[PDB]
Structure formats: C-alpha cells, structure tokens
Amino acid sequence: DAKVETHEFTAEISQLMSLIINTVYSNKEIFLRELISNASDALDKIRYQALSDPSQLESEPELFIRIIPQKDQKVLEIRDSGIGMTKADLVNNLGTIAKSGTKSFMEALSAGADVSMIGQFGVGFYSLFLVADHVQVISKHNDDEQYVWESNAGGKFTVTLDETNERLGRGTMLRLFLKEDQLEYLEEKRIKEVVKKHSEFVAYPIQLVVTKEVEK
Numbered sequence: 001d002a003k004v005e006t007h008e009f010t011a012e013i014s015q016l017m018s019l020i021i022n023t024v025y026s027n028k029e030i031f032l033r034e035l036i037s038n039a040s041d042a043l044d045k046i047r048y049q050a051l052s053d054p055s056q057l058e059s060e061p062e063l064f065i066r067i068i069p070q071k072d073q074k075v076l077e078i079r080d081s082g083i084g085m086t087k088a089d090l091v092n093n094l095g096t097i098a099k100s101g102t103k104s105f106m107e108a109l110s111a112g113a114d115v116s117m118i119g120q121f122g123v124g125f126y127s128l129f130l131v132a133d134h135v136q137v138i139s140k141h142n143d144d145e146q147y148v149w150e151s152n153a154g155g156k157f158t159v160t161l162d163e164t165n166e167r168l169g170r171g172t173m174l175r176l177f178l179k180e181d182q183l184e185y186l187e188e189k190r191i192k193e194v195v196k197k198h199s200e201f202v203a204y205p206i207q208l209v210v211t212k213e214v215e216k
C-alpha cells in the first residue's frame with residue numbers, strides 16, 4: 001500500500017499548465033515532437049554514461065522510443081529507454097523547483113510567440129496539456145526503484161512507488177489521458193503523419209505498437 005506523496009507545483013508552473021490546458025492554439029500536434037525530443041534527450045544521457053561504463057545499459061540493453069495507443073482507455077503512452085528519473089528527480093524536475101523557462105515563455109506568449117516555441121524554453125513537457133487533461137509519468141533510473149508521478153493540471157502532483165505498472169527496466173513512460181476531441185492521436189495513420197513531419201531527425205528507433213484483429 002505505497003504511500004501517495006502529495007507535492008505542490010511552484011506557482012509559475014501551475015500558471016503555465018493552466019494556460020496550456022485552456023489555450024485554443026491550432027497546432028496541437030507539436031506535443032508529440034516535444035515528448036519525442038525529451039525522450040531523445042534522456043536516451044542521449046544514458047548513451048553518454050554507457051560510453052564510459054557499458055554496464056549502465058544492462059537494465060535495458062536496447063535504446064528506443066515506443067508509442068503505444070491504448071484505444072479502450074483513451075490513453076496514449078510514450079515510452080523510452082533513456083536514463084530515467086529517480087523519485088527525487090521526479091519531485092525536483094517536474095514541479096517543485098521553479099524553472100526559469102516558465103516565466104520567460106509566458107512572457108513570450110504574451111508578446112505573440114507561437115506555442116510551438118515552448119521547447120526553446122526547456123518546458124516542452126507541459127505541451128501535453130494541449131491534448132490531454134491528465135498524465136502519469138512512470139520512470140525507472142538505475143539508481144532508484146520505479147515510481148509514478150501523477151498530475152491533473154492543477155496545483156498539486158503526487159509521487160508513488162510503482163506497484164501497478166509494467167516494469168520499464170530503465171527509462172520513462174508518459175501515459176496521456178487524451179481529451180475527448182483529441183482521440184485522433186490514438187490512430188496509427190495520424191501518429192505516423194506527425195512523427196514523419198516533426199521528428200525526422202532522431203537518432204533512435206521510433207516504434208509504433210498497433211493492435212489489429214486477426215480476421216477469418
């Protein structure tokens with residue numbers, strides 16, 4: 001019965017989340033580019049460590065990004081085998097500590113910036129609220145157990161020891177609970193379109209998991 005630890009977002013991050021979840025910006029599909037870039041960055045970090053110490057890869061030898069539609073749940077999962085995040089990393093990097101990126105980006109938006117520039121401010125993760133109203137971040141770093149960070153775009157998030165999801169081995173899986181009007185991002189054809197348009201230059205395989213009935 002793992003303790004659910006509740007934490008408060010810094011005010012700036014709560015402010016940014018509210019802006020994104022409510023914005024009517026047109027090009028919502030850039031969320032996927034931002035999340036694939038975060039995955040690629042985490043994969044770059046384990047590759048760097050493994051160049052010196054190859055044993056760091058033994059927890060999951062393959063380096064990949066994997067997109068898993070869960071149609072019945074209205075959930076889109078994005079998994080990577082990058083370096084992952086410890087419990088402390090999840091609490092520190094995903095809410096409690098003000099990122100400079102938040103304020104500068106919000107000022108840029110007020111001045112006319114395109115929401116698509118969010119990654120240039122280091123806060124591209126929060127673009128998921130363009131298409132989702134709830135997210136779980138499941139992560140496993142070689143230095144810690146597997147943990148789940150969870151938020152509903154409010155001012156609070158939780159961190160819980162993971163006793164309910166598939167083991168990642170090493171890496172991170174985002175579970176996006178999609179809005180009711182954004183279910184196109186569960187479709188194979190649409191996902192492929194978005195990946196090919198915005199994520200052509202990625203050094204890791206981008207795998208798409210598709211479920212089909214075996215016909216008679």
Ligand SMILES: CCOC(=O)NCc1ccc(-n2c(S)nnc2-c2cc(C(C)C)c(O)cc2O)cc1
Nearest residue numbers: 038039041042082083084085093122123124125172
């Ligand atoms: C806190 C917001 O920061 C960002 O939006 N991007 C920078 C970033 C990129 C990768 C990681 N990361 C590391 S280090 N290990 N795993 C990840 C990771 C993080 C995310 C988001 C939750 C930030 C992700 O979608 C995928 C990841 O592999 C952390 C921060």
